[PDB]
Amino acid sequence: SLVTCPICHAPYVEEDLLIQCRHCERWMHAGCESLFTEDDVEQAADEGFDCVSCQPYVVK
C-alpha cells in the first residue's frame, strides 16, 4: 500500500484524495473506490470504509 493499489496495481504520485480500509489497513485511491467527492468519503469514513476485498469476503 501507499504505492500500489489492489484495484489499480500501479504506481502513483502522492496526490488526489486518499482513503484506507481499516479492516485491511490498506491505502487506495478514492476514485477507484467509487469515491468522487471529499464530502462523500468524509461520511463514508465516519461510518467506516470497506475496500473491494471486504465486500465479497464479508458477504457470502
Partner: peptide, 9 residues
C-alpha cells in the same frame, strides 16, 4: 480508532 482512515492530498 473509529470508522475508516482517510487522508486529503
Amino acid at each position: 480508532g473509529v470508522g475508516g482512515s482517510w487522508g486529503v492530498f
